[PDB]
């Protein structure tokens, strides 16, 4: 219970890692706003957050949707103190697949971070944590994301804002449960720990970086992969 | 003269690093096609390349410009064997300027590499070298570029194509003694690098002498 | 008190980071054994740990000292569950000016010793299918080249060991502190190299160590956690 | 002949990578002194170097003796090129042997040749990493040492770099698809490919490259 009084915005909180993060921050006293791409999803999020938060529909690409969501949050809870971003053959993918991945996984983090920084710097306290993609098989967006975070971290560090990245490994999610046994085994073979990580393990790391315990940790990429 | 028979496409060959790279590859026997964002810039390139190449207009942002340039090069010289791809506070950038940077420094390398690969692979030989931006609003694109190259490198390594990145540091390209001193204080070497020094590194990676080097980022910055 | 029932061995717990780590683990329920190179040093540790632990003299350079200390701990508390290798205070110097004497002493104290200690405590960790080994990097001083080799070798050793013992429930990590509070014009020269604009507290390194030693970081291993304020 | 007038000391030049490096620098005009642990080794090296150099016996763990011999016959050294089980299984003995042979020796050699380089305000120190756990610390310590030394002597015109080879067809590799399956290039590298990289870093064309680890491993 070290987040009382803090407001956290967690994108993609429908399930898996996103939901574990939202429930963990909520269980530790934060008021949580989890987002989904549809209104039904948003309502599902509101149903599990109960009195500890609310779910809102958000399209991370649309700059209009971002402004809209932030306005609803300000009207009901206040300014966002914690932002948690939850997101083929490279010579055969179409320009669409390329732009979609850059837009969704890279540019959106830039637009959201930009939208919440003003309040954070004014209050001289803030946390921006981005969750990297979960290992699903045995790149430019992921690497660009880390480069952006290290750069932003340096820029806003003096104002009391930390910007970090949590890079999960082979974590137990729907996508990994939907893989075939041969596929799972191949990946698991690449994991020293010899087991898959739980969604809660990524959430524990996020909760740590979001707390006052890590005020001096910024521009860091924390890997939670059992040794991959 | 170890490039004899090879065709190299160097984007942004108007001056500085780009031109040093184009002149070095040409001096070592390659047929060089340097590009500029205008026909005027292109002619200037033709004039310094002479009998060793030609300058063409390339809008690395238009799929049609890319295809158009590659078609001209095929008619004249053949297939491309060597491809060489040549500020403000973050929270003060507008969506528009962030998009221009990603699209100009990241997506364009993806489009160009894609356009020249099929031929390289059929030929079982190729070189793709990207030059990083010469020293915060470029960090994302820059890091994405390196990530893209390492990933592409693994994908095409078995067909004899290497994909590398050369990351220059401070390169002489004016300032007051105080500004210059501030720069020198950041470089252990104590001087600025020359455009030719980046070109020497590129020439090395493009040669057969670097056939086993791929997915590497070669820093030429005096230990910065 | 999420460390209740766990025994932690913290080397170099006399002052600074080492002591903050020892007090933090103790405050969270662990039975702590902090070490010093002298007998008087160990007693000072014993005084501040009170009923939550004890201080023992240990010379990591001496394999006879290591087993001696581990025997005392096993006789009074039990098997070591958490091992924290705390680097001493570094006193900077230039590479091309350091003699075999210093070079050898830094390797021996900063690299080989971690190897010998980790080796000494691993079996008891494996039989329990649970263990934590955390090494603290040399804190950046006021140019720390003479510690650079040993530091990089240490990280390499940890990543490698992490990969070897991960399936047994043991995590091996490294915490790399930046500028820590331990003369104002020189002050500004240091601060200017830190984006956050301030020095870190010894407690901030201890918070990171406490996190990695807990059950919440069971899936974190072979990682180097930098606590340097963006430096 | 990019190296005309330069003197290069290459340790472990008996065969493989070491010899390829020695022959390449010699072929490009350098006066080369290759070393070995024995005399047949040193003599074997002098044989293949001919009028381009000489072989000397050198136990890197002797250094001042070798540097003195080179100093009397050729001059100061301008280019210096430095050339298995589970960890919980290692004994203190093996662990120390590895640290001395692969880490401390580079420190001692670099220290022995720096004064000269500094005085001449020009120098090259290249260390070849281990070809492909018990060597994990020495290798990583080596890179850390090089980056640190590189910053220290950069203003004096000396560059310190590391070349990290991947699976290079040697004698071990002669005895497979298992390691090949690890490398994207689908083939093993040649000893000459590591030598080309070393030759490049040792030349004037690489004066602004320092503290860098150049991997030559086929995308591995």
Which of the other chains make 3 or more beta carbon contacts under 8 angstroms with chain A? B, C
Strand residues in chain B grouped as ranges (E): 7-10, 31-36, 53-57, 82-85, 126-131, 161-168, 217-220
Residues B40, B42, B45, CA angle at the centre, nearest 5°? 120
For residue B97, the 8-state DSSP code is: H
Residue pair B222/B189 in contact by the 8 Å Cβ criterion: yes
Residues 6+ away with beta carbon under 8 Å from D20: D190, D191, D192, D194, D195
Q: What does the alpha-carbon distance between residue D92 and residue C115 come to, in Å, rounded to a whole number?
A: 9
Q: Residue C150: closest CA among chain D residues belongs to which residue?
A: D141
Instruction: Give the C-alpha separation, B145 to A106, whole Å.
Output: 13
Give the C-alpha separation, D101 to D87, whole Å: 18
Residue A50 counted as an annotated binding residue: yes
Nearest residue in chain A measured CA to CA from C164 = A192
Contact C180, C17 (CB under 8 A): yes
Report DSSP state, residue C120: H
Distances (CA, A) of C181 to B102, C126, C178, C202, C211: 40, 37, 10, 7, 21
Q: Which residues of B touch D206 (CB under 8 A)?
A: 200-201, 220
Which positions in chain A touch C164 (Cβ < 8 Å)? 192
Distance CA A84, CA A45 (A): 15
DSSP strands (E only) in C61-165: 82-86, 131-136
Q: How far apart, in whole angstroms, are the C-alpha atoms of residue D85 and residue A82?
A: 47
Per DSSP, the three-state class of A204 is helix
Residue B78: both structure tokens together: 């053949």
Query: Does the beta-carbon distance from C148 to D145 stay under 8 Å?
Result: yes
Q: In 3D, which of D213, D80, D149 has the Cα closest to residue C149?
A: D149
Q: Is B65 flagged in the annotation as binding?
A: no
Answer positive or negative: Cα dihedral of C5, C9, C14, C19: negative
* Cβ separation D186–B223 shorter than 8 A: no
* Cα pseudo-dihedral C191, C194, C197, C202, rounded to 10: -90
Chain B positions in Cβ-Cβ contact with residue D210 (cut-off 8 Å): 188-189, 222-223
**In this complex, do C152 and D144 lie within 8 Å of one another by their Cβ atoms?**
yes
Beta partners for residue C10, in sequence order: C34, C84
Q: How far is D129 from chain B (nearest CA, A)?
A: 15
C223 is in an annotated binding site: yes
Structure tokens at D8: 């290069």
Query: Which two structure tokens, joined as six digits, stand for C154?
Result: 């240490």
Residue D210, judged by CB atoms within 10 A of its CB (0-12, 13-18, 19+), counts as buried
Technique that determined the structure: X-ray
Name the catalytic one among B31, B127, B138, B199.
B138
* Contact residues, chain C, for A218 at CB < 8 Å: 195-196, 229-230
Pairing of strands A7-10, A31-36: parallel
d(CA A43, CA A47): 6
Q: Which two tokens stand for residue A109?
A: 């983090």
Q: Inter-chain contact A98–B107, Cβ cutoff 8 Å?
A: yes
Q: Is B139–A151 a contact, with Cβ atoms under 8 angstroms apart?
A: yes
Those chains having 3 or more beta-carbon pairs within 8 angstroms of chain B are A, D
Contacts of B148 in chain A (CB under 8 A): 90, 139-140, 143
Secondary structure of residue C226 in the 3-state scheme: strand
All domains in chain A, ordered by first residue: 1-228 (3.40.50.720)
Q: Helix or strand or coil: residue C60? A: coil
Q: Using CA atoms, how far apart are residues A130 and A12, in angstroms rounded to an integer?
A: 12
How far is residue C144's CA from residue C149's CA, in Å, rounded to a whole number? 10
**Cross-strand pairs, D125:** D80, D160
Q: How far apart are CA C149 and CA D107, in angstroms?
A: 10
What stretch of H or E contains A224? strand A221-224
Token pair belonging to A177: 């449960």
Q: How far apart are the first and last CA of chain C?
A: 33
Rounded distance between C-alpha atoms, residue A189 and residue A159, angstroms: 43
Here the tokens at position C202 are 């010894």
Residue found by looking up tokens 């230990």 in the block? B223
CA distance C61 to A122: 51
* Pairwise CA distance, residues C61 & A84, whole Å: 45
Pick the residue from chain A with its C-alpha nearest to B111.
Answer: A95
Chain A interface disruption, residue of B97, B99, B115, B140, most A CBs within 10 A = B140
Cα Rg, chain A, nearest whole Å: 17
Extract the tokens encoding D93: 């003995």
Q: What does the DSSP assignment read for chain D?
A: -TTTT-EEEESS-SSHHHHHHHHHHHHTT-EEEEEESSHHHHHHHHHHHGGGEEEEE-----HHHHHHHHHHHT----EEEE----GGG--HHHHHHHHIIIIIHHHHHHHHHHHHHHHHT-EEEEEEPPP--TTHHHHHHHHHHHHHHHHHHGGGTEEEEEEEE-SB--STTT--HHHHTT-TTSSPBPHHHHHHHHHHHHSGGGTT--S-EEEESTT-
- The residue of C130, C220, C226, C231 whose CB has the most chain A CBs within 10 angstroms, and thus the best one to mutate to test that interface, is C220
The CA distance from B80 to B45, in Å, is: 18
- The whole-angstrom distance between residue B127's C-alpha and the CA centroid of its chain comes to 11
CB B193 within 8 A of CB B17: no
Other beta carbons less than 10 A from residue A2's beta carbon = 12
Q: Tell me the C-alpha to C-alpha distance, in Å, between residue A16 and each of A128, A202, A228.
A: 20, 10, 20
B48 is catalytic: no
Residue of D nearest to B200 (CA): D205
Q: Which of D57, D135, D156, D192 is catalytic?
A: D135
CB within 8 Å of A180: residues ≥ 6 apart: none
Distance CA(C66)–CA(D137), nearest Å, equals 21
Residue among D9, D2, D1, D45 nearest D124 (CA) = D9
R_g of chain D, CA atoms, integer Å:
17
Please judge whether B190 and D219 are an interchain contact, meaning their C-beta atoms are less than 8 angstroms apart.
no
Contact call for A151 and B90, based on CB within 8 A: yes
**Interface contact flag, D154 B193, Cβ < 8 Å:** no
- For A155, name the nearest residue in chain C, comparing CA atoms only: C195
CA B174 – CA C1 distance, rounded (Å): 63
User: What's the rounded Cα separation, in Å, for the pair A74 and B100?
Assistant: 31
Burial class (CB in 10 A: 0-12, 13-18, 19+), C201: middle
Number of H helices, E strands in chain C: 8, 7
| Whether A and C touch (3+ CB pairs < 8 Å), yes or no | yes
Residues 6+ apart with CB under 8 A from C15: none
Q: Inspect the structure and tell me whether chains C and D have 3 or more CB pairs less than 8 Å apart.
A: yes
C-alpha–C-alpha distance, residues D194 and D196, integer Å = 6
CB A166 within 8 A of CB A224: yes
Q: Is C151 annotated as a binding residue?
A: yes
d(CA D134, CA D139): 10
Element (H, E) at B123: helix B108-123
Nearest residue to D156 (alpha-carbon basis) of D213, D212, D203, D115: D115
């Amino acid at each position: 219970m070290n987040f009382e009084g803090k407001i956290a915005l967690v994108t993609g909180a429908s399930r898996g890692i996103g939901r574990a993060i939202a429930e963990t921050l909520a269980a530790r006293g934060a008021k949580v706003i989890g987002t989904a791409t549809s209104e039904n999803g948003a309502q599902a999020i509101s149903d599990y957050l109960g009195a500890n938060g609310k779910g809102l529909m958000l399209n991370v690409t649309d700059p209009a949707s971002i402004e809209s969501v932030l306005e609803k949050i300000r009207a009901e809870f206040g300014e966002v103190d914690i932002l948690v971003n939850n997101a083929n053959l490279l010579m055969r993918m179409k320009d669409e697949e390329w732009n979609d991945i850059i837009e969704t996984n890279l540019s959106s983090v830039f637009r959201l971070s930009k939208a919440v920084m003003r309040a954070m710097m004014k209050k001289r306290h803030g946390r921006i944590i981005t969750i990297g993609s979960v290992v699903g098989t045995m790149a430019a967006a992921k690497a660009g994301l880390i480069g952006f975070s290290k750069s932003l971290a340096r820029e806003v560090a003096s104002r009391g804002i930390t910007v970090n990245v949590v890079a999960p490994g082979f974590i137990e999610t729907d996508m990994t449960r939907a893989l075939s046994d041969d596929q799972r085994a191949g990946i698991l073979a690449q994991v020293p720990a010899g087991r898959l990580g739980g969604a809660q393990e990524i959430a524990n790391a996020v909760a740590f970086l979001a707390s006052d315990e890590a005020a001096y940790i910024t521009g860091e990429t924390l890997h939670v992969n059992g040794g991959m």
